[PDB]
């Protein structure tokens, strides 16, 4: 009485059901409008998928662009946190602190038996790439999901400097992956999605807090503008934030 008769919203024919089965044998009634939902309607940010072994081991070293002081990302993230809390007292123990803020442009499983020597050659490959580059301006706009909703992050948009930055980071991915046979997560040839994780469900909270952050808590900001900011430093850091807040600065490069 207010639309089509047999809408194409519900026009669906699933073919993992055998033939004839829905004809004369059996009914398969389900809800298909959630398995046919788009990454734009959920938040699946197709993160570089690490294979078996590199998935078994935890991130040891990680390349990250450092945020400067007196940001816009920091302040808009601060108001996002105020509203996370005024929305729910539940969700404070899931948010990442403001000081742990960084920009993740790659994680890497490094062995300690060849630790500092490999870190040095990696530093060569990083500085030999980011030497001629100018300081980088990026765009933060709209969040997404890592770990199937486990991680909420303010992706940097590909709309200002992702081209240059990804030539750089796929170069250093190729170098750390095929040149010096270090374990970056994915293929030596893949391009790791640079990301700004703003909250996360960690294995130490999976049990109580879940395996999927509640899309109601943050979804008002899933497509919010978080700001365009400039940055000058690509740092390889070892995964220990408790040093002085920001993770152990195992190497820096100024731009």
């Amino acid at each position: 009485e207010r639309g089509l008769y047999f809408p194409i919203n519900h026009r669906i024919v699933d073919r993992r059901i055998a033939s004839g089965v829905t004809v004369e044998e059996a009914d398969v009634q389900s809800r298909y409008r959630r398995e046919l939902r788009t990454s734009f309607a959920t938040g699946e940010t197709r993160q570089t998928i690490p294979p078996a072994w590199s998935a078994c081991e935890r991130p040891t070293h990680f390349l990250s662009l450092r945020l400067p002081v007196r940001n816009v990302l920091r302040t808009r993230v601060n108001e996002m946190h105020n509203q996370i809390l005024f929305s729910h007292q539940q969700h404070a123990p899931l948010l990442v602190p403001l000081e742990k803020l960084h920009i993740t442009l790659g994680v890497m499983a490094i062995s300690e038996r060849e630790e500092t020597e490999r870190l040095a050659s990696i530093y060569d490959c990083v500085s030999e790439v980011f030497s001629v580059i100018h300081p980088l301006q990026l765009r933060f706009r709209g969040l997404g999901t890592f770990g199937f909703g486990r991680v909420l992050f303010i992706r940097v948009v590909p709309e200002a400097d992702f081209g240059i930055l990804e030539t750089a980071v796929s170069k250093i991915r190729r170098r750390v992956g095929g040149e010096l046979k270090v374990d970056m997560k994915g293929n030596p040839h893949d391009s790791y999605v640079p990301h700004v994780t703003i909250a996360k469900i960690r294995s130490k909270q999976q049990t109580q807090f879940g395996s999927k952050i509640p899309i109601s808590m943050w979804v008002e900001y899933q497509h919010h503008d978080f700001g365009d900011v400039t940055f000058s430093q690509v740092d390889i850091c070892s995964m220990r934030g408790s040093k002085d807040g920001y993770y152990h600065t195992e190497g820096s490069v100024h731009l």
């Binding site: 073919r15 004839g20 004369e24 009914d27």
Partner: protein, 252 residues
């Protein structure tokens, strides 16, 4: 006439042309119609080879919370009839149900009695078929029923089969087919190895037959008003078995 692919026609929130769901009902003879020709193959099984869970020693003892967690699908044969715990037993004398067990009994020891048991929970029903006497099967020494001490003992062995299920359930979760392993009769070969080996002389050729076959009685063509050509009519030679182009033996 073959099978089409998908329902493209109707809203699948209202199941429309779907051939209905078969539910074997324990009250009525259909329960035994289905579960009856199955027992005979498990009998030929446990008369050929040893399969573990058939020849128990007693009932299973499990709390009434876990009864439905192990039993449903449990089927085993005890030395004599004895109701397991938490059940009531109802004998059946309905001939329309009993009639099926004919092929059971004419191949193994004849069936003595048949019961349906219902749990005090009302939800676990055990069709329990008690057999009697010397088996017709050459039960093998390494069977399971051979360990049931029945073929060891002399005549008058009353062993009894039990098959547990939930009620009102289709003939799918009746896990009685998974024992359709077919094993032959090697007792038959057991002649040519012991003391009959020098007694039996085998003939390999055929003997000189000087006499042709004695013909059947002369054919008197039918005299009723026949249905017609059972080829053109799609009726199998006896409405029973055969090939519609092997239309032997329908009046001509």
């Amino acid at each position: 006439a073959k099978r089409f692919r998908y329902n493209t026609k109707y809203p699948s929130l209202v199941s429309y042309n779907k051939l209905p769901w078969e539910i074997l009902n324990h009250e009525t003879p259909e329960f035994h119609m289905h579960v009856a020709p199955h027992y005979e193959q498990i009998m030929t099984l446990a008369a050929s080879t040893h399969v573990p869970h058939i020849v128990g020693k007693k009932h299973l003892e499990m709390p009434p919370e876990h009864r439905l967690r192990l039993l449903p699908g449990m089927f085993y044969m005890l030395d004599g009839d004895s109701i397991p715990e938490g059940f009531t037993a109802n004998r059946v004398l309905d001939p329309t149900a009993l009639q099926y067990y004919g092929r059971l009994e004419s191949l193994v020891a004849p069936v003595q009695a048949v019961r349906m048991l219902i749990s005090d929970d009302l939800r676990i029903v055990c069709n329990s078929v008690t057999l009697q006497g010397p088996l017709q099967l050459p039960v093998a020494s390494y069977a399971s029923l051979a360990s049931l001490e029945v073929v060891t003992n002399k005549a008058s062995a009353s062993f009894t089969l039990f098959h547990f299920v939930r009620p009102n359930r289709p003939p799918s979760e009746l896990q009685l087919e998974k024992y359709y392993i077919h094993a032959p009769r090697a007792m038959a070969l057991a002649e040519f190895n012991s003391t009959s080996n020098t007694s039996w002389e085998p003939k390999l050729q055929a003997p000189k037959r000087s006499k042709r076959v004695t013909p059947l009685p002369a054919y008197r063509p039918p005299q009723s008003y026949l249905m017609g050509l059972a080829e053109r009519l799609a009726v199998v030679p006896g409405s029973s078995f055969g090939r519609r182009s092997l239309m032997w033996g329908h009046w001509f």
